[PDB]
């Protein structure tokens, strides 16, 4: 069980599960981002399976979690790799775009600015890679949890909450190691989890304009 892993073992599992940074393959704009996202999703599915506690869930529940988190997950990766590129979003090393090039779509402008603002927040906070991988894991486990009343669902949520607790402990550990005081540790933990609400929001806004999916992701998880 994921529940007996030490903090160091958890960080180390998450660091080893990290997908690679993918490249763009080249109006053409949405085609290029569509193609990049779809390739990313294949690696995300494999990363998911390596997140401690994830394959303990039913196949149905795994698919639910991925259906609910996949865009937030692409967004937090985007924002992470954009940290060192103020004013720009590094979709791929060969696809670094600004809000002006974001205007080139329909409605994504304001979301572009939101993504840019999250990136600045991370840079400002000096988010570490070890912290980022825990955040990503938290999104995967958390996003779909409150939308799976049977007894089995009740077991599924309890497991997720215990794995989530383990990831909280891991985050606090990293901060402790980094030399922050206890007051700085609770404050930074809160600040990062609050950013996860903003990521949920950007994801919702992203979904409204990019528009079943569950079935598509089921075929993928199977494949």
Ligand X SMILES: CC1CCN(CCOc2ccc(C(=O)c3c(-c4ccc(O)cc4)sc4cc(O)ccc34)cc2)CC1
By the criterion CB under 6 A, which residues form the site for ligand X? Answer: 33-34, 36-38, 40-41, 74-75, 77-78, 91, 108, 111, 206, 209-210, 213, 216-217
b/e 166-197 (16+ beta carbons within 10 angstroms → b): bbeebbbbbbeeeebeeeebeebbeebeebbe
Name the binder of 204 from ligand X, a second copy, none, CB < 5-8 A by kind.
a second copy
45 binds, among a second copy, ligand X, none (CB under 5 to 8 A by kind): none
The 10 Å Cβ neighbour count of residue 5 is 18
Q: Where are the alpha helices (DSSP H) in the chain?
A: 7-17, 28-50, 59-81, 99-103, 108-125, 129-142, 151-177, 182-210, 213-222
Write each residue from 149 to 188 as x if it is in contact with a second copy (CB under 8 A), else as -, in one continuous string.
------------x--xx--xx-xx---------xx-xxx-
Q: Would you say 159 is a known binding-site residue?
A: no
> What does 114 bind: a second copy, ligand X, none (CB cut-off 5 to 8 Å by kind)?
a second copy
Tell me, residue by residue from 191 to 220, as one string, x for binding to a second copy by CB under 8 A and - for no binding: x-xxxxxxxxx--xx--x------------
The residue among 82 and 143 lying less far from a second copy, judged by its C-beta, is 143
d(CA 175, CA 166): 15
Phi-psi label, residue 126: left if phi above 0, alpha if psi -120 to 50, beta otherwise: left
DSSP class of residue 223 equals -
**SS3 label, residue 52:** coil
Is residue 79 within 8 Å of 115, Cβ to Cβ? yes
Residue 42, contacted partner among ligand X, a second copy, none, CB below 5-8 A by kind: none
**Minimal CA–CA distance to 69: which of 171, 212, 213?**
213
Which of positions 77-116 make contact with a second copy (CB under 8 A)? 113-114
Binding site members for 17beta-estradiol:
40, 81, 209
Binding site residues, a second copy, CB under 8 A: 113-114, 117-118, 121, 138, 142-143, 145-147, 161, 164-165, 168-169, 171-172, 182-183, 185-187, 189-191, 193-201, 204-205, 208
């Amino acid at each position: 069980l994921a529940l007996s892993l030490t903090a160091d073992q958890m960080v180390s599992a998450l660091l080893d599960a990290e997908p690679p940074i993918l490249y763009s393959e080249y109006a053409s704009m949405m085609g290029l981002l569509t193609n990049l996202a779809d390739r990313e999703l294949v690696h995300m599915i494999n990363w998911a399976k390596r997140v401690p506690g994830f394959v303990d869930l039913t196949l149905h529940d795994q698919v639910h979690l991925l259906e609910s988190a996949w865009l937030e997950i692409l967004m937090i990766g985007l924002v992470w790799r954009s940290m060192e590129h103020p004013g720009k979003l590094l979709f791929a090393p060969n696809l670094l775009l600004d809000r002006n090039q974001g205007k080139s779509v329909e409605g994504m402008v304001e979301i572009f600015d939101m993504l840019l603002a999250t990136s600045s927040r991370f840079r400002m906070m000096n988010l570490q890679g070890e912290e980022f991988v825990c955040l990503k894991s938290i999104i995967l486990l958390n996003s779909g949890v409150y939308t799976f009343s049977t007894l089995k669902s009740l077991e599924e949520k309890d497991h997720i909450h215990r794995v989530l607790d383990k990831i909280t402990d891991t985050l606090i550990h990293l901060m402790a190691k980094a030399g922050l005081t206890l007051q700085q540790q609770h404050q930074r933990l809160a600040q990062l989890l609050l950013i996860l609400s903003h990521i949920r929001h950007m994801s919702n806004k992203g979904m409204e304009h990019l528009y079943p999916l569950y079935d598509l992701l089921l075929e993928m998880l199977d494949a």
